[model samples]
Target chain A: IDDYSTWDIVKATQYGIYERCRELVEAGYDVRQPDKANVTLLHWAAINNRIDLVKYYISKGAIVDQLGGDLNSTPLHWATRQGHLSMVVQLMKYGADPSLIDGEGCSCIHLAAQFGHTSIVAYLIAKGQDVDMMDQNGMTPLMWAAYRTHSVDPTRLLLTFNVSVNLGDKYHKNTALHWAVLAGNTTVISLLLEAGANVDAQNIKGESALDLAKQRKNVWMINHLQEAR
Target chain B: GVVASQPARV
Candidate 1:
C-alpha cells in the first residue's frame, strides 16, 4: 500500500510488463523506489518470476538483493524458494547471490529444499552454491529435503552434491534423520538410517530422536526407525 | 528396390 506514483514500477513488474516499465521509467517514473512493505519494485519483479521485468529494473539501477522490505526476501530468494527455476537462472546470470540468507537464516537453497524445488537446488549447485551450508539452526538443505520429501526427491540429490547427512539443527541438535522421522517420511527416514545416521543421536537437551518420536506419539515412525536401525 | 544400404533385419 505504498503511496507511490500512479505508474508504480512494482505494479508494472507485477503485471510482467517489461517494455511498458521501460517506457514508464524513461517517462520519469521512479524505478528503485520501495513500496509500503519496504519492498522495492525490483523485489516484486523478482519474486513474481517476471524475469524480463526484473532485468529492466536491474538495468535501471535496481539492487538485486535490496533488503528494504520487512521480510528481507530478495528477488533471488523469492524465485528459487518458490521453484521458479527459469527466473532463478536469470537472476543468477545477472549476478544474484545464491548464498544470500534471509532474516530467518534460510537461503534460496533452504526454501528450494523445503518446498521440493529440485531443479532450483540443482541449478544452484551447478552455480557453485554451498551444498553443506547450514542455517542459523544448523539445518542444511539436506535436512529440509529429508523433512519435506513429498514434493521432491532432494535428499539424495543434495547428498550427492555433498550436503552432510549427520548435520543437525541448533534448535533440536538433531540430524536430518531426526527431521525425517518427525516428518513421518518413511522413505527419507530409511535413507538417512542407511546413510549411517546414529539412531541414538542426542539432541540439544539430552533427548534422542527416539524420545521425540515417543513424545509425539508417532508410533508408526517410532517402529519404522527402530526397524531400520 | 532392396537398397543394400537400408536392408531389413532378419
Candidate 2:
C-alpha cells in the first residue's frame, strides 16, 4: 500500500536486481505485498528464474507458497511452470507446497509436464510429490505430456515413476493414450503403449484410441495402436 | 459421449 511496496520490488526481482530488492526489504518493504493481480515479488522472481532474488526473498521470510489470490498461483507454480529447477528446489526447501493447484486447478507437476520440463517433473516426483495428482479436469501430468507433442522425455520420465497411463480426463474421459492418439504422433503413441497403456481404453464418446487414429486415417498411427492393443 | 462443450483442460 506504500511507495516502497509498489511494483519496484516486483520489477527488481523480475530483472534479478538483488541489491534493489535487498534495499527495499531493508527499508521495510513487504515482499508479501501482491500487485493488483495478486502477484508478489516472489512470484515475479520465480517466474523469471531469478534464483538469487528468490533465495533472498525466502531468507527474508517470503511465503514460499504465497497465493497470488486472483492471479491464482504460488511462487512454486510459477517456478515449476517456467522450468526453474533450482528455484523449485529452493522453494520446496523453504516448505513450498508442490500439490497446491493454481486458479486452473493445475498443480506444479502438471505445469512442469505441460511445458515439457522433464528434469523438473523428475525432481518433483523424486521429492515425494504426487505423481498421479489430477487437476479439476481429471487431467494428470501424463495427460498433459501426451497432449503436447513437444517432447516425449517428460512422458518417459513420468512413466518410470509408474504413473497410470490409462488415467482419463473428466472432460472426455480420454486417457493418456487417447490424448497421444489425438496428438497424432506415432512416437508418443508407441511410447504410451510401451508403458503398458490400455490400448482399448475409450473416451467419453466411446471412441477408443484406435478409433481416433482410424478417424484421422493415420495409417502408421492406426497400425501402432493396433499392435499395442 | 465426450461433451462438445467440455471444460478446457487448462
Candidate 3:
C-alpha cells in the first residue's frame, strides 16, 4: 500500500524500468509481491509487454501461473487479454497453463477471443489448445468472439479450425448464433450462418436466434435469420 | 420464448 505513484520497484516494474527493478530486487524486494491491488509485477510486466521484466520476474521466482487473489488470474491471462503475443509466448514458455481460468472463469484462449486477439487465439490453438475450448462459463472461444467482439478474424480463425457453431453455453444453452444475435454482431452472425450455425437453435428458454433478433427489433438480423432458417 | 437474461458476462 505504499505510494505506487512514487518510483518504487512496483512502479518501476510496471513501466519496465529495469534499473530500478534490478536495484530493488538485488536489495531484497521479492518479485512475487502482489502489490496493493493484489496484482503482481509479472502481471504488470506481461500486460505492458515488457519482455525483460517478465523474464527477470520469472527468474526471480514469480509463479508462472500464479493467480493474483480477487482477480484469480495468472500473468498469462493478463497478457492474453491485452493482446500481447510476445508476452503470451514468454509466459507459456515458462509453463503458464493456457487452460487456467481467470477470475471471470475464462481461460487464456477465451480472453484472446473476447478481446479480438486473432494471432493469440491462433497461437494458443496451434500450441495444442482445443479449437472449441470452453471456459468455466461453458463459453467457447467461438462464442466469446461471436458475442464480445465484432471483428471477423478471430471468429473466422476459430471457424477455420472447425469449431462447433451449434455449441451452446452451459447456463443459457445459447449457441453461437444466439450470442451473435444478442450482441447484434451482424458480421459475425452472417459468418455463423454461413459456417452452418443452427438458426433455429434455442436456449434454455427455447428462444431462437431469430426470436432474439426480433426482440432487438433489428430488422436486418430478423431478415437474415428468417432467410437462413 | 424470450431471453430474460444471459449468462454472467465479465
Candidate 4:
C-alpha cells in the first residue's frame, strides 16, 4: 500500500481495481485524498460509474459531497451528470445532498435535466430536491431541459413535477416556453401550454414565446401559441 | 374616379 501512489489509486478506481483500492484503504490511505484537481477517489469512481467501488469508498468514510476543482461537483453531481441512475440512487440512499450546486450552481436535478436523464430527474425530484433551484444563469431545471436539443421528454417530466414553466434565464429572460419555441419543439410547446405557461411572457428583447415561434415561421408552434393565448 | 383610357390601335 505504501508503494501505491495517488495516481495508482486513481487509475485503480478508473479501471475498477477493487482489491487494490481496498488494500490501500486498509493501509490507512485516506479515501478523501484528492489529486491535483481536488478530485477524490469517489470522484473517479463516480465518473467511471464504478458503483461497487463507490459503495466501498463510502463505507470506508469517503466524503460523498466532496467538491472537486473548477466544477466544485460532488460525486452525486458527477453521477447525475453522467446519467448513472443506479449510482444516483446509491448516493442518495447514503444521504448525499442533492441540493448542492456545482461551480455552475447546477443541482443534481439541473445536471440530470441537462443530460436528458428523465429517470434520474424523476428520482431526484421525488427525493425532495428543489424543482425550481436556479443556476448561475438563473435557469431552472425545467429551463435547462427545454433549452437542450431533443430533451422534450425531460421537459415533460419537469412539467409533471409542477416546476414553474415561465421561469426565465438571466441574460435573455427567456422562459422554458421561450426555449421550447426556439427549438421548434411543438410537442414541448403544447406541453408547456397545457401546464399553463404564460403565453405572453416576454424576454429582455421583448419577444414572447409566440413571437419567437412566428420568427421561426413554425406554423405548428405559431398556431399553438395563438391558441394558447 | 378617373375612367380607364382605351388602348391605342397597332
Candidate 5:
C-alpha cells in the first residue's frame, strides 16, 4: 500500500484545508470511506463545522445520511451536536434526514435541544420536524430539554410551539416536568409549570414532580411546585 | 460491523 503518497483527505477535511482535500480526492480516496475509526470524512467535516469540506464531500458523493462514529450518527447529527447551523443547513439541503435517530435514539432536534442550540431548534421546527417528535424511548424534545439543558430558549421555544407538556416516556411515564425536577433544571422548572405542565403528573414509579423534588430535597423546586399545585 | 460505544454527550 506504499505505492502512493499524499496527505490524508480526512485530515485536510477536518482542518478545512480545501485544496488538500481536493488533491487527495483526486488521488482516488473515496469520500464515503470511513477511516480506521469508522468515521467518514464527512463526519469529521461536520463535527468541525468545515462548510467547504462538507460541500465538496457531499458533492463528491459522500452519503449525507451516512451513519458513523461510536454513536452511529450522521454528519448532520455531528453538526447539530456542535451547534453548526450552516453545516446542518447544507447537510439537510443535500437530503440529510434530520429526523433519523443516532445510536442512542436521539434525533438532531433532541441534540439541539439538549445542547441549548435554540436557533437550530427553531429552524428544525420550521423545516417540518414535529415539535413533539419522540425518540426510540419515547422521550420527546421537551423531555430532553428539561433533563439536559438548564437555560431557557430551547425549552422556551418548544413551549412556544405548543409541545404537549404532559407526554411521558414509555418506560417510566416521566413527564417533562418530572425530568426538569430530576435534573434540577431550575430555570426550566418555572417555564414548564407556566406552560401548564401538570404539577401532579406522576411517573410509572408513582412519583410526581413534587415527589421527585421532595426526594432531592430541592426546597426551591418543592416550594415552586407546591405553589403551582 | 458492530457499532462502537456511544459517544460522550452533554
Candidate 6:
C-alpha cells in the first residue's frame, strides 16, 4: 500500500534480491503495507517471478505463508502461475502451503495443469500435492488432461498416476470422456474410450457421449463412440 | 498389512 519497509526488504532478500534489499532494511522501510490486492511487496516480488526480490523480501521480514484472500494465495501461487519452477521450490522450502487454493478452487498444481506446464506439474506431484483434486467443477487434472489442447503428454503423465478415468463433474455429471467429446478431440475420445471409460454414462440432462457428439456435429467422435460400443 | 486373500495375485 505505502512504501517498502524493513520487512519488505527482508522478503526481497530471501527472494534473491539480496544486496539492494539490505540497503532498504538499513534505511528502515516498512515491508508491511499490502497492496490493494492484499499483496505485500514481498507477495508482488514472488508472483512476478523476481527470485532476487523474493529473497530480499524474505530477509526483510515477509512471512513465508502469508495468505492474500479467499484464494489464500501463498507466494507459491504466484510463482507457480509464472512457471517459475526454481522459485516455487524455494517458496515450498520456506514453508509455503502446497495445498492452498485460490477462490477459483485452483491449487498450485491446478494452475500448472491449466497452463499445461509439465515440469511444474511434475514437481508439484513429486512434492506430494493432491494429484486428483477436483476444482469447484469437480473436474480433476485427469479430466482436463483427457481434453488437453496443446499437449497430450501432460495429460498422459497424469493418467500414469492412476487417476479415475470416469470421475464425474458436479453440475453436468459428465465424465472425462464426455469432456473430451465436448471439446471435439476425437483423438482424445479414442484414447479414453479404449481405456474403458463408461461409454453410456449420462449427464444430469440425460446427455450421453453420443448426444453431445451429435449436438456438436462432431462426426469423428460420433463415429468413434458408435464403433467403440 | 491388510491383505485381500480372496483375490488371486496378478
When just chain B is superposed on the true chain B, each candidate scores a TM-score of 0.22, 0.38, 0.35, 0.38, 0.31, 0.25
> lDDT tens digits, residues A112-151, model 5?
9888999999999999999999988889989999999899
lDDT for each residue of candidate 3 in A126-194, tens digit (9 for 90 to 100)? 999998887898999889988888878888889897677798999999999899889889889989988
| TM-scores (chain A) of the candidates | 0.88, 0.89, 0.95, 0.85, 0.95, 0.81
lDDT of 6 by residue, A1-229 (tens): 8344434443554344555666775677666656555666656667656666666668767887776643556777767766778878888877787777766666777778866777888988998877888776677776766655445656767776867777788877888888888777655676677677777889889988788888988677778888888
Docking class of 5: incorrect
- Give the poorly placed runs of model 5, Cα more than 4 Å off: A1-7, B1-10
- Per residue, candidate 4 scores C-alpha lDDT tens digits across A64-135 of 898885577888888887778998988888888888888877778888887789999888777777788887
Q: Rate the local accuracy (lDDT) of all candidates.
A: 0.73, 0.79, 0.83, 0.79, 0.86, 0.69
The worst-scoring run of ten residues by lDDT in candidate 1 chain A lies at A2-11
lDDT of each residue in A1-229, candidate 1, tens digit only: 9333455566666767666677778988777777666767766676677777877788878888776455567878777655778888898888888777876678888888888888888887887778877776678888888777754378767766544667678777878877877777777876677667777888778767777778888877788767866
Tell me the deviation in Å of residue A124 in model 3. 0.4
Candidate 1 wrongly placed segments (more than 4 Å) = A1-8, B1-10
Give each candidate's fraction of reference contacts reproduced: 0.00, 0.00, 0.00, 0.00, 0.16, 0.00
Q: How close is candidate 1 to the true structure, as a TM-score?
A: 0.84
Report the CA-based lDDT of candidate 1 relative to the real structure.
Answer: 0.73
Which portions of model 2 miss their true places by more than 4 Å? A1-7, A69-71, B1-10
Which residue pairs overlap in candidate 2's backbone? none
**Shift in Å, residue A180, candidate 1:** 2.1
**Which is the leading candidate under DockQ?**
5
| Candidate 3 Cα outliers beyond 4 Å, as residue runs | A1-6, B1-10
